């Protein structure tokens, strides 16, 4: 099973895939660039998470971070079981050497479109993943 | 190497104006937030105005909202905040300070202030 | 508006000590930054978001935490650790800090 997600690590030889990938180790020293997650569709069966090969914040995904606002207003840390509002969501760890995977796993359909995010952090360098999961049409 | 270089201190009469003004450098200065916190006699720490990475939102607390407007000016890498009607208690160490959406708006770079003292 | 007060205003200490400072919130905050600031110098960036040291901030540091009450400790303080340490919100408009906890050391 894919994961949809970003891996910020520089590693090849993982047992987890991921859709997408920014390799944080290649982003400039205080640096905070995105990975840009987006998933549509009328019931979902999917594994979504990250890769980080450093600290990871807030603790994801049993909480997230919320996205950020257009107004000049503060984005909290929030539970991700009342962001996306369903009672069932699966969580997963693994840790590979240094690199730290947290996923969750969602089934059906979400009631409302909502965003959130993660951050990674390594040394100096940081990039953070946003993600989208879209409510049915 | 990121730095921030504000300019502008002085002494300024009661009731008077003031422009203050933070030089950027050694990063994208339009990616991130700004704003001006300022550091009393007492130490205390407060944010006068922020302001959104393209210059489209703004916030002050209700202490200077209305008197203040924070501005930034992404062709030439500078913060800018005028101060109007200002008080004896808007005396204070003024510092020009970054946030970025993706390292949960933490400050982690911040110039080394410029004074004003408001007094007639 | 979120008020955050920060205990003791001074905590007196003598190299080798472990130690804490907390960081109170008048009502919930969902995380805390803490800030180092030195005479003659800026705060610096110490602890972001509650747990996660800057760059630089050695190990014996760590912050914890969570709805009103924060901390910050030292496993064992240090001489070079004599500064005073603010906590910061921002959960609501506007954001703010607390007043600091200054770490002295005792003679």
């Known amino acids: 099973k894919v994961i949809h997600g970003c891996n910020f690590s520089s590693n090849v030889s993982s047992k987890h895939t991921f859709t997408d990938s920014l390799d944080i180790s290649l982003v400039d020293d205080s640096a905070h660039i995105s990975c840009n997650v987006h998933l549509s569709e009328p019931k979902y069966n999917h594994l979504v998470g990250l890769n980080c090969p450093g600290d990871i914040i807030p603790d994801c995904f049993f909480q997230v971070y919320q996205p950020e606002s257009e107004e000049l207003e503060p984005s909290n840390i929030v539970y991700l079981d009342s962001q996306i509002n369903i009672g069932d969501i699966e969580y997963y760890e693994d840790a590979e050497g240094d690199d730290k995977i947290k996923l969750f796993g969602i089934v059906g359909s979400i009631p409302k479109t909502t965003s959130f995010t993660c951050i990674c952090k390594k040394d100096k360098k940081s990039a953070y993943m946003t993600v989208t999961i879209d409510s049915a049409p | 190497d990121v730095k921030l270089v504000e300019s502008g201190g002085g002494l300024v009469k009661l009731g008077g104006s003031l422009k203050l003004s933070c030089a950027a450098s050694?990063?994208?200065?339009?990616?991130?937030?700004m704003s001006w916190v300022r550091q009393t006699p007492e130490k205390r720490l407060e944010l006068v105005a922020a302001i959104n990475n393209n210059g489209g939102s703004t916030y002050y607390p209700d202490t200077v909202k209305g008197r203040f407007t924070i501005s930034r000016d992404n062709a030439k890498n500078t913060l800018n905040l005028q101060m109007n009607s200002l008080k004896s208690e808007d005396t204070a160490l003024y510092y020009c300070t970054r946030q970025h959406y993706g390292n949960l708006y933490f400050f982690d770079y911040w110039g080394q202030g410029t004074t004003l003292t408001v007094s007639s | 508006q979120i008020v955050l007060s920060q205990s003791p205003a001074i905590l007196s200490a003598s190299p080798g000590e472990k130690v804490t400072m907390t960081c109170r919130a008048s009502?919930?905050?969902?995380?805390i930054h803490w800030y180092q600031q030195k005479p003659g110098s800026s705060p610096k960036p110490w602890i972001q978001?509650?747990?996660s040291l800057a760059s630089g901030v050695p190990a014996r540091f760590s912050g914890s935490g969570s709805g009103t009450s924060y901390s910050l400790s030292i496993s064992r303080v240090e001489a070079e650790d004599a500064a005073t340490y603010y906590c910061?919100?921002?959960?609501?408009?506007?954001?703010?800090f607390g007043a600091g906890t200054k770490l002295e050391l005792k003679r």
């Open positions: 050694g990063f994208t200065f339009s990616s991130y937030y």
């Open positions: 009502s919930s905050v969902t995380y």
């Open positions: 978001a509650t747990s």
């Open positions: 910061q919100q921002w959960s609501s408009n506007p954001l703010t």
